[PDB]
Design an enzyme around this catalytic site. Structure first.
Site, PDB file in Angstrom:
ATOM      1  NE  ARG A  35       2.584  -6.134 -17.815  1.00 25.90           N
ATOM      2  CZ  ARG A  35       2.479  -5.241 -18.797  1.00 25.90           C
ATOM      3  NH1 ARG A  35       1.287  -4.746 -19.134  1.00 25.90           N
ATOM      4  NH2 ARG A  35       3.577  -4.836 -19.434  1.00 25.90           N
ATOM      5  CE  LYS A  45       7.272 -12.160 -12.346  1.00 26.13           C
ATOM      6  NZ  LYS A  45       6.890 -11.367 -11.134  1.00 26.13           N
ATOM      7  NE  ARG A  89       5.436   3.089   0.905  1.00 25.69           N
ATOM      8  CZ  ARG A  89       6.691   2.974   0.467  1.00 25.69           C
ATOM      9  NH1 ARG A  89       7.205   1.793   0.145  1.00 25.69           N
ATOM     10  NH2 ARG A  89       7.441   4.056   0.353  1.00 25.69           N
ATOM     11  NE  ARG A 101      -3.481  -3.597  -4.837  1.00 28.01           N
ATOM     12  CZ  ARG A 101      -3.246  -2.312  -4.546  1.00 28.01           C
ATOM     13  NH1 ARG A 101      -2.008  -1.901  -4.243  1.00 28.01           N
ATOM     14  NH2 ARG A 101      -4.251  -1.438  -4.553  1.00 28.01           N
ATOM     15  NE  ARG A 128       6.105  -4.475   1.101  1.00 27.70           N
ATOM     16  CZ  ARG A 128       5.868  -4.501  -0.205  1.00 27.70           C
ATOM     17  NH1 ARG A 128       6.833  -4.788  -1.069  1.00 27.70           N
ATOM     18  NH2 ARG A 128       4.641  -4.246  -0.648  1.00 27.70           N
TER      19      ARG A 128
END
Length: 202
Positions: A85, A13, A150, A161, A124
């Site tokens: 948020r 975004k 990670r 998440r 990643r």
């Protein structure tokens, strides 16, 4: 005009935000930036926000609003990128805006399937001997360079998440739906086609 851009991480975004800002002459606003600056300068609200972080508390909403109201451009052309948020923030933002006889014109929701976000984020890899980022699928490291994944990029965690992101965002979405200002963008598309949708809605 005033735009809000919302979407989960992986949606792209901000790339869309920065391009529009550049072509149309908007101020791109990330609350992270404004907060960081105020705390560093040690302005009165900067100092107050700081005491909260030191204790282990969130910065109260009315403080973030007041920080925004401070550095708000006179021409009133801004893009909010990832803020509000919460519903609470949305209400307080609306209130401080109409105090200037202004409103949110469009809220762009960047929708992208969980499957695609997981592929983007989980892929990643990091060289921990530079910090230079790679992606097993998009940009693989040389066979030989030591790379790790990670803990946060494990599909399990990302799944968790998105779930948290949706719990928090659903009521925000519904609030803007109720005002007739929510535009849905299909962000699964190529970048040039995503930009086309944004231009179409504005």
């Amino acid at each position: 005009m005033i735009l809000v851009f919302l979407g989960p991480p992986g949606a792209g975004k901000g790339t869309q935000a920065k391009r529009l800002a550049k072509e149309k002459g908007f101020v791109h606003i990330s609350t992270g930036d404004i907060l960081r600056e105020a705390v560093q300068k040690g302005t009165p609200l900067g100092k107050k926000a700081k005491e909260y972080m030191e204790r282990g508390e969130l910065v109260p909403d009315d403080l973030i609003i007041a920080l925004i109201e401070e550095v708000f451009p006179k021409h009133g052309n801004v893009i909010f990128d990832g803020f509000p948020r919460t519903v609470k923030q949305a209400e307080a933002l609306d209130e401080m805006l109409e105090k200037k006889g202004l409103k949110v014109d469009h809220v762009l929701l960047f929708e992208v399937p969980d499957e695609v976000v997981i592929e983007r984020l989980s892929g990643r890899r990091i060289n921990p001997e530079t910090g230079e980022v790679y992606h097993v699928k998009y940009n693989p490291p040389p066979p030989g360079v030591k790379v790790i994944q990670r803990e946060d990029d494990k599909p399990e965690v990302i799944k968790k998440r998105l779930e948290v992101y949706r719990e928090q965002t659903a009521p925000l979405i519904e609030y803007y739906k109720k005002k007739g200002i929510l535009r849905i963008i299909d962000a699964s598309k190529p970048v040039e086609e995503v930009y086309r949708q944004v231009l179409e809605v504005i």
